[PDB]
């Protein structure tokens, strides 16, 4: 029988306001070697992005950003015209790639088709300041100030000391000197170039020193998050993925403190469940939908300006999989992002759970929509417990529910939202209508184990 929990919504308990460009995706820079991928001709992928949000941010970076070499006279290889660059697996050095004017031109058209903004990595790991300045100038020329949100100078510079990009002694002080050299060169070509950083993988010690040094030179602070811990941890499981992550909480507190010290907001510019491209049986499953949707809300509630789920190719954790030649599909994680998209923007409200110790991985978020209607996003991440949620603090004549479902937490397919899969080119509309039982001030929602729900009140 279900665990009977209470949820009290408090319309006076005002949280953060979710911005319209919160959602986003991250891709490997190597993908820019193929001018057909981020292209106005890529209508399938553009549709998948639009379904994730009418505003949002595309970030391009990752390990391959140290292996991409812009040149104004470059041409893609024949193989480049067909490249599908999935998440770098981190086992050895990435292949060298060139980036061309054509690809940047086509990226511009892709951003126009999607309505999304751009965070663009520059090659601080192996490239030169002058080449970065030239690349930045072309990007600014072509993409424009309104769509270019920030350049980033290197990806995960806190890992250069161990991945061959720099010697073992590389540290924040060394990075700060590299950053300044690149910044100076770029600003000579592009005096209005916007920056974010430090784009770190994990090392929270770099946040303070970076922000204090470069606070007048950046628009926002960026860092990364993977749910999987260090290599010496036990292998990630779905059970672990559903549970709170104290490292996340600490990282988020570090970022909040930077904002308190400097005024700079923060964005989680690369995230996913498990590293090395993901873990088959965890990252590519329905549990990842629950994980991702919940993470989006947790971070929004903490004051993040947005998020960018890493992906590409057919990587285990990619939200969207596919290629221009074979087409694109929504993977399970996409459906958690879709729940967020459908909820929309607005101000988060207090949403306190009680009587929930037997269903501790249920999370709930309440929102006053931009349209004035109350929504509640719930993630029943308990893998073995169904819940019955008694909802107080909401007065409405009618509420509806859209369910986020799969038959098993580990399913790699069979994921639906609102009773429907996402179709080709991101097409989605709900096919199952359900009213929330109960009435004004006392609604009652059942949720099966390992499921999610979006409630909308009239
Ligand atoms: N503690 N400690 N240090 C050990 C390092 C572990 C932390 C992150 C390592 C994996 C990061 N690695 C993430 C990703 C992946 O491995 O899936 C890959 O595709 C992207 O290109 C990278 O930017 C980033
Ligand atoms: Cl806060």
Structure description:
Beta-D-glucuronate binds at residues 28, 63, 88, 155-156, 270, 276-277, 317. This is Beta-glucuronidase C-terminal domain-containing protein. With 458 residues, the protein is of the alpha/beta class. The chain has 2 domains: 1-19 and 345-458, Immunoglobulin-like (Sandwich), CATH 2.60.40; 20-344, Glycosidases (TIM Barrel, Alpha-Beta Barrel), CATH 3.20.20.80. It is built from 10 helices and 23 strands. It has helices at 43-52, 101-114, 129-143, 160-163, 172-189, 207-214, 238-241, 246-262, 286-301, 332-343; strands spanning 3-18, 24-28, 57-61, 68-70, 97-99, 117-122, 148-153, 195-200, 220-226, 266-272, 307-311, 320-323, 327-330, 346-354, 362-369, 374-380, 387-392, 399-405, 416-417, 434-435, 438-439, 442-447, 451-457. Strands 1, 14, 15, 16, 17, 18, 19, 20, 21, 22 and 23 form an 11-stranded mixed β-sheet that branches. It is globular, with a radius of gyration of 22 Å. The two termini are 30 Å apart. The structure holds the ligand [N-]=[N+]=NCCCCCCCCN1[C@@H]2[C@H](C(=O)O)[C@@H](O)[C@H](O)[C@@H](O)[C@@H]21 and chloride ion (CL). The site of the ligand [N-]=[N+]=NCCCCCCCCN1[C@@H]2[C@H](C(=O)O)[C@@H](O)[C@H](O)[C@@H](O)[C@@H]21 has 16 residues, from loops. The ligand [N-]=[N+]=NCCCCCCCCN1[C@@H]2[C@H](C(=O)O)[C@@H](O)[C@H](O)[C@@H](O)[C@@H]21 binds next to loops.
């Amino acid at each position: 029988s279900p665990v009977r929990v209470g949820l009290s919504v408090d319309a006076s308990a005002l949280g953060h306001t979710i911005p319209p460009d919160y959602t986003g995706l991250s891709y490997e820079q190597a993908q820019m070697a193929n001018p057909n991928y981020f292209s106005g001709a890529n209508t399938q992928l553009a549709g998948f992005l639009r379904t994730l949000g009418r505003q949002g941010v595309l970030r391009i970076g990752g390990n391959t950003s140290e292996y991409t070499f812009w040149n104004r006279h470059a041409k893609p290889t024949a193989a480049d015209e067909h490249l599908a660059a999935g998440p770098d697996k981190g086992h050895h050095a990435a292949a060298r790639e060139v980036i061309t004017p054509e690809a940047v031109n086509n990226l511009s058209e892709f951003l126009d088709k999607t309505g999304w903004k751009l965070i663009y990595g520059l090659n601080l790991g192996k490239g030169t300041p002058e080449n970065a300045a030239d690349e930045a100038a072309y990007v600014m020329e072509t993409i424009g100030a309104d769509r270019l949100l920030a350049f980033q100078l290197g990806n995960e510079p806190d890992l250069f000391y161990r991945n061959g990009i720099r010697p073992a002694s590389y540290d924040f002080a060394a990075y700060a000197g590299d950053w300044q050299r690149f910044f100076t060169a770029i600003r000579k070509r592009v005096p209005n170039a916007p920056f974010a950083g430090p784009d770190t993988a994990y090392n929270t010690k770099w946040l303070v020193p970076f922000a204090d040094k470069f606070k007048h030179d950046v628009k926002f602070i960026s860092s990364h998050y993977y749910a999987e811990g260090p290599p010496t941890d036990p292998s990630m499981t779905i059970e672990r993925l559903m549970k709170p992550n104290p490292r996340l909480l600490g990282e988020t507190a570090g970022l909040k403190q930077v904002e308190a010290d400097t005024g700079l907001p923060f964005r989680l510019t690369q995230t996913n469940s498990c590293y090395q491209g993901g873990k088959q049986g965890v990252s590519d499953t329905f549990a990842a939908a629950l994980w991702a949707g919940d993470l989006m809300y947790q971070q929004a509630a903490a004051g993040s300006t947005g998020i960018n789920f890493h992906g590409g190719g057919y990587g285990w954790y990619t939200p969207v999989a596919g290629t221009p030649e074979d087409g694109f599909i929504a993977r399970p994680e996409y459906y958690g992002m879709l729940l967020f998209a459908q909820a929309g923007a607005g101000q988060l409200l207090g949403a306190k759970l009680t009587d929930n110790s037997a269903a501790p991985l249920l999370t709930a978020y309440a929102l006053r929509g931009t349209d004035g209607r109350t929504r509640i996003a719930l993630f029943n991440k308990n893998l073995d417990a169904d819940v019955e949620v008694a909802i107080s603090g909401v007065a409405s004549p009618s509420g509806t529910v859209l369910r986020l479902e799969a038959p098993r937490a580990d399913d790699t397919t069979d994921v639906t939202f609102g009773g429907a899969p996402v179709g080709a080119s991101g097409s989605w509309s709900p096919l199952v209508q359900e009213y929330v039982p109960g009435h004004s001030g006392q609604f009652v929602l059942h949720m099966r184990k390992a499921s999610g729900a979006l409630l909308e009140f009239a």
